[model samples]
Target chain A: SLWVDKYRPKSLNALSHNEELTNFLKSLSDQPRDLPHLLLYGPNGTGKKTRCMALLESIFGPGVYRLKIDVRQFVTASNRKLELNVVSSPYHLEITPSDMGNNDRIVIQELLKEVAQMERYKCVIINEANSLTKDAQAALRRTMEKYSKNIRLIMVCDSMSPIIAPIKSRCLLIRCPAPSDSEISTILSDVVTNERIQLETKDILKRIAQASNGNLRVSLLMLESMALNNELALKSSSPIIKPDWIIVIHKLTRKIVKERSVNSLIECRAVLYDLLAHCIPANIILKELTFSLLDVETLNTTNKSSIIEYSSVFDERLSLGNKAIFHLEGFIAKVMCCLD
Target chain B: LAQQPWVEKYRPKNLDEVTAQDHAVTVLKKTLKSANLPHMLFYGPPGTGKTSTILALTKELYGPDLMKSRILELNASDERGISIVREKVKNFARLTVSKPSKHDLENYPCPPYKIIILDEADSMTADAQSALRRTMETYSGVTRFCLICNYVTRIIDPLASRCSKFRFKALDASNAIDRLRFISEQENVKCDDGVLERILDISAGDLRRGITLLQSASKGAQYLGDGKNITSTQVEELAGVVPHDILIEIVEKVKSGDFDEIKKYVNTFMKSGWSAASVVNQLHEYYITNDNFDTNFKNQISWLLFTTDSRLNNGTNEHIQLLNLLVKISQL
Candidate 1:
């Protein structure tokens, strides 16, 4: 099991950070009937999901965790079918309909209506809420209002801007900001102690914390990966390999900066195909490649601007193209031409 | 029982019967004769007997009696995710056969391992593929995986490297024609002039599609009259091949810088429920083959066509992208 899930805070008091939010949720659970709909907005790895589950446990008890995964299918007006997976228990249901893309509105309207018709009060948690389409958000607003008596909504999202005002007003919006490096380090140390693993140095924990960019979940996973690789006694000379995809991206970046030719562009395309095959999202690859170009010292400002400009163009084109390799290869060819 | 589709009906049941994949078949037959086989990856264009070859090889190895119990086939494109890999694949791979039945051992020679065919394996997500990598290793003693995909590049390097890949090429014209002619004779269907050739041209060496088109054309002829004669026009309609003249007209308009004419043709083409990607691809083929344009012009137009193809893949408004492509072609 991943340490991220293995060490997830079970109770309100056991949560690592956000003590104030934890206390507030604890107090709300004392009066379970009065618990309003919640909108927990946060950056990735800030424990929004953890807090949501803990809050559910505080109110409904541990029964909420006994969930089974269900694959639900919804059809659109144009007869296109969309499938989304939902995890549900007796009292609450969880879904991330953003995976349905534009057809999410049908899922929101149909599935929520069906769930809301049940007798007991239920909580429906929508993860990655920001990716919901505008029409889906509109459908969600009406569903929240109509099902207010029987259903409580918990909208977990990375950003609040895309959520409509109507839906936003119906729930209490709470921001779970990314933890500071020190806070992450303390949390890592606590996990390390619980796992009975010895850290080579306090500095190593801080280094892992810093490298994780304030994402506690990433830091824990990195630490666990290092331990699994038998790198517990961290050597200062040795570098930590963050993830397999990251290493692939680094190699791709080097290939882009080292050469400028059509043949080389095609070669870079092969690398992009490999990255995409490994399931790395194209946008993330674009963003990381752009930063990698910036890191190159030999590339002057003109080269940098050209690389960045085409990166954005390809990023926009990435959304337009289904196969990300083409746009990514297009970007590489553009970069090679610009350099030439 | 319901009548089986012609594609399935005509599928080869033995490795020796497979066409246009001699190298793959030779290696698979050798592996089977020795009773030692590595995990395999079969990749190629559709209707080229990738799946058929694997099925034939498995049938040859296990015979008909044990084929059902020893082989698990899953289409990754339909049920793709890490959960399926964990629950369905792992569960199937983890099971061990108890004492061998005397009747089964008598009918067929027992193989040491079972086979798992993951069709369209490239469609699996990276995480699922990664999980699959571990499962492939863990169950190597009991289960061997044969991953089938159209695009080998879409498969990750680790998984691709672990398997001995076999490339199944599209059937050549001779082989495809022979197969179609055989099937036609088997079904006792009379073919009109150029019917088989038209099916081959439209299917582009896809034997399954050629068979399907032949079946549909034969059915159309029966519905119309005596089921004795099939026309080239009927074959084209059945295969959804746009009239060759329309394709040429569209190309000529673009080459002559006639934007309005191009727009009108494209509008009619899309409104007729023709797929934009197919139209774009067909136009590209025409552009590349035509001798009117210089090398430089062809190069520029090819890039434009490539970008337009990518844009179409991105699911942009099809009409708008088609228009944009037309406008760019007019300028060229």
Candidate 2:
């Protein structure tokens, strides 16, 4: 319903920032040489990974074929030097920090060895490279040295310095900054327009832009959740666009603790899971329920203890699955007795 | 002799005969001669002479007049919480010691110091204890207090430090047997050796419980063997533990979800002296061994155990609590 996912920039020109960098990438495509290794570093959700894909497409031309492997599964030290092809067209692989677990040296060595042997063009992209352990980074340094010509390495890290000196020297490095405020606002306004939502004031979009903390993805997701509950209501408030979904769930949880009805608790659990599915943390949900319980008008002595005790017991039951039903039932009984 | 309660009948009459508390007796006797007694805290396990020694001291100090003028005794368990100490202790301590009239003050002596005995003192709340410490100091000139309790740790360190402390040990097997023998000889009732051994084992080193068991067993002794000779079989019958074997079978049935077996187990334990709350208490202990169960199940057992314990102690509706425990366990 929201345009965050709908309006993700699909091409290199559509992306914001670094005109000279884009020109440099465009110039590489014209030459009939193998694509050079590139390292892109920036904050999370800033289109570093997306821009890499765009660049690969430009090199191979639109509609080009490539193999997309989840490198953590296949490219480990244990299986790093396996036979593989990277030539006829460029292939893309995503590497997270977990891939560094096996002797970072062996993994790096084996990854470089296998990619170098590819008959065609090859590129391995490591995401979150800064999160890898120091030992892993050291091993990675030797990797670029062994196979500089045979294989191309593109690493995406949060900071450029973490990409060891040797690895930096071997590759053309591009620093990607976060999107500008105007670029983020443009994305939000386009979504509001496409969804046929009317805004009473400009501050709504500005607030969403400011609230997103420059992460376009979060800005888009917040609008999407607002749109889901009430597309028209997204623009109801001028400055801060608050969704009523959180309030609805909080009210239901309060009823569960106060009413002590089995049916109400079941309903509360279902609504809670729905809220969880939308990315609300469980601990935050518990905190909201506790505050609501304390606010009830007719509180009893036992009820006060019950609220504190049941909250902890519920947290414990989440870890231990076998006795969940019994714990939950006893919890309900305690709550009911407290009400009396 | 046969008509007297066996516990009091066999209770030690002389100071030396108080078994298992030789140290406490020796120290207390020396304190008596000085005409000055330290504020005292008598603490140990139950049935370990905390109450008995205080009762004996009162008798020895004032003789027959002990029942009247000089002493006040109260059990902390019967009333509300430890809050009772402020109102009752302070009110009793405020009075002046009046000289005995129309009777020789020499025969029914009025000592310079008044004695206040607080039984089961551990049940007092922290706030009450704080109030008591203040009262203890204010009245120290005219009053001497003895705070008797089962567990010393529960008493506040400030109060414990202000008084003389004594540790009482539980009666051992030989002491229990000797007391049981004394009771039987005083009552002129003969009991077989097997009956005596069974009473010792059941009492678990508690001297008073052994006498209670002896009194109950003597009634059924005629059927087992000689009227004067009571056997272990007769003792077991009197205590109603002959059917306790059903508890093990019931435990299996409850674990396996055999509803029929559970019903039989409930009926068998109920037929004996064990209440539903007591049965749940035992089950709570049993579930500790259930390794396959999850954390949620362990928490449920703990809740049931605490609820049953509180209900029985506070005189709440235990049947309601037990029914709720059953419903929760059924879900488990």
Give the true-contact fraction for every prediction, in order: 0.03, 0.00
Candidate 2's C-alpha runs over 4 A off are: A1-340, B1-4, B81-85, B98-110, B188-203, B216-242, B251-274, B277-332
**Candidate 2, overall lDDT?**
0.61
Tens-place lDDT per residue, model 1, B185-240, is 99988888788998887877777767877876665455453445887877765444
* A1-340 per-residue lDDT for model 2 (tens digits): 2366566655667666556556655655554254556677655566777777667777655543354333233354345543332223345455554444545444555666666776455667776675565556655655665565556667786554334544544455565656666777777777778777767766677777776556677777877766666656565453344345657655764676557666766766666667666777554455445445645657753454456456545544433444334444455455655665
Weakest 10 consecutive residues, lDDT, candidate 1 chain B?
B267-276
- lDDT against the true structure, per candidate, is 0.76, 0.61
Question: Which residues of candidate 1, in runs, are more than 4 Å off?
Answer: A1-340, B96-101, B150-154, B219-228, B255-271
Model 2's interface RMSD: 35.3
TM-score for every candidate vs. truth?
A: 0.50, 0.41
The most accurate candidate by lDDT is 1
